[PDB]
Fold this protein.
Amino acid sequence: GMTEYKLVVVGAGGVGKSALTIQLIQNHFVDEYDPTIEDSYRKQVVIDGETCLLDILDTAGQEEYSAMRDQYMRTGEGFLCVFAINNTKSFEDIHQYREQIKRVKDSDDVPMVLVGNKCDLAARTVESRQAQDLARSYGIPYIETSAKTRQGVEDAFYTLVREIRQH
Amino acid sequence: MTEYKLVVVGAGGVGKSALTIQLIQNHFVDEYDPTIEDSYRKQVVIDGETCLLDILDTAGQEEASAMRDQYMRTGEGFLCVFAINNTKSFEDIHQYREQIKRVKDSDDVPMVLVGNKCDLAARTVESRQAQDLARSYGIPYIETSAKTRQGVEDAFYTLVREIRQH
Amino acid sequence: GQMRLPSADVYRFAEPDSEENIIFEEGIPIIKAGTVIKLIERLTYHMYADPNFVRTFLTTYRSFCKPQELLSLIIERFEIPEPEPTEADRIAIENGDQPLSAELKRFRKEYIQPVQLRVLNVCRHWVEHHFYDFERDAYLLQRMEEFIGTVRGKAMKKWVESITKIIQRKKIANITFQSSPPTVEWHISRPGHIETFDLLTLHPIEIARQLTLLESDLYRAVQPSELVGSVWTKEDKEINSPNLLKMIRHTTNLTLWFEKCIVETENLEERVAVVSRIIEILQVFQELNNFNGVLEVVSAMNSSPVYRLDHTFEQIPSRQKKILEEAHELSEDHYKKYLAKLRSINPPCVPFFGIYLTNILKTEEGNPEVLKRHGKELINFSKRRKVAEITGEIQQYQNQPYCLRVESDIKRFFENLNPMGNSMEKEFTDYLFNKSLEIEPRNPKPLPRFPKKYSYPLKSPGVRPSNPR
Ligand SMILES: Nc1nc2c(ncn2[C@@H]2O[C@H](COP(=O)(O)OP(=O)(O)NP(=O)(O)O)[C@@H](O)[C@H]2O)c(=O)[nH]1
Ligand SMILES: Nc1nc2ccccc2n1Cc1ccc(Cl)cc1
Ligand SMILES: [Mg+2]
Ligand code: NA
């Protein structure tokens, strides 16, 4: 039937990464969530007029299980590499996440998007020009998202699906 | 996984808490800290079926005797515990049996009669007298020691089987 | 009719329920949201006890109420005013007779004593199961001691004297089975010869047993204080979640050790024996319900350095391929089969903690702290109940001990395991991947041969236990 895309969210912990998938999968208009509910990470969407099913793996909270990253990453067809725009270290981590994805998938051309996430009102420390330059150096899209208003969230996931479709 | 609500009742100091903690943690509590109300959970396979026991550990002290209806309404089965070296605790059993029957408005409530502290030599309640009472109630009688674990699983899991067949 | 209550002007907990101060979910009621005053009222309600609510509240309340303020509020709850004599009592007294005091006696028996006892039950649970509030705030402990130590009146006396003693014991602060644990098993390494201990020289049964004891102890040591508020992800995680982090770091180190044992065995035949031995350890982990250990092994086999070793995988016996594949399928579809298996086995077990962490974090991030209703902000208690359902499941599997004997030397060997040495993580995992490329080069590079490194027999003793008299 319809195509299913296995997407994987990766990025530093402790800086609101989990809000991206929560806001996507959520009842958009009721701020509520039970992650234990079977298929709280599956969503049927229409992208460019074609219906598909998103299966999103977000292991937020398990970042200290660093030897499990390979196993989790290998399940994915496309990757959202997420940093927080007020945490420079999480932005500096992106290079090694991308290198690890390429190794696990054994490909130099893995569908992925760079996501700069605004997780609170603390001062931004990564300017969008810096993140655009990094994404261009990798040949991948850059999307900025708000962890509170849902802005950019659909764009991040839909852009990644387009990267998969056009691979 | 089926869930079972068990309630442990009986006079103060007979060992309701020590029995429960021995079941839950494999540890014998030497201290006598009177209970107000405690609850425990235990996943366990009984007769090849996995279930989840919710165990309510209640107050034996008479100062709490007006607060029992609320937990008797929710419980599905009751361990009625006395100590085999305390005759008064055995005489108290029938008050618990009658109150449970009144609250649940039923003559057919799952129960097990438990004679605890069977590791102690100085017994004052004979097994025959307790067995006669259990027969008059239609329920099994199991002697236990929260100290040595003798009979402890038998008492709780027999009560589960009675709820299951209810 | 119902008992009359104190005036809400002298006793705040007598205010009527309304949607402006409490909201119930759709046979005791379940609270969706409420003011802190209403939460504490229902925590100590005169009509029924709610021990699960006490645990939920004491586990999660610090996200909406400070410990010092909670103590002030339950002391306020405790101090209930008694009603004045009624008209019938007045008329008896005016005639020099003793009043019946029927309404006063009922209010004592059915309101004051149950509420006061339930306040004391909150104090008792607080001290016994959440004592860290008092370890971290000595003045809070002094206030609790003073409150308990000055409760007068005979109805509460037994529990006041008990709680005083419990507090004193907690300030200065044994397992029985009826079956014996099985005999410790030895292979090439003999007892006391710790210098020869290694993956292939210890008995694979005993490797799995001693790692299960270690991992069980680490699992059982994690307290809810390390989890609520997602504190293991925040900047102070080393301060607030030390037992959790020790447990995770053990799991990571063991996974890396398995990978290192594999890729540093350059001879193909020897490496097949290493991988086969690790799968035998995985089989014993499965038999022991050590799911953390199962996934430690599976994570190693799915790592980039090991996963690509097609020549090694080809020679694994079919029955061991099936054991590894079955273990891997536990994690598929977001751990569907693992979750079902955990809920079906007979404990003791060692759960995989990572799923709990993700679910606690997402519950906290995905639900608001307050609900706004009729101009009022109500504490969203349903969110805290969901968190406490997870911490309660964790605690349920922490109760059951393993009936296995500790071997102190094998325990120490695995406690001191340090596969990374002084290397940083990236340097070390790049080393492992480069070893993988050395021992099985990318096609079309030919497969080289390498000399043996082990001087002792590679044949496994197997994983079925032995039993001499
Ligand atoms: N020898 C022996 N002592 C026991 C046994 N069970 C309990 N005790 C002891 O008897 C005392 C009272 O035990 P406890 O479990 O607190 O009794 P309880 O029925 O829960 N009391 P309460 O109704 O006040 O909560 C403790 O000192 C405990 O160690 C048993 O099987 N054998
Ligand atoms: N083919 C395969 N089936 C698996 C099931 C679960 C985990 C890993 C699995 N691999 C890769 C593998 C395993 C072990 C070695 Cl030594 C070399 C490659
Ligand atoms: Mg007790
Ligand atoms: Na920064």
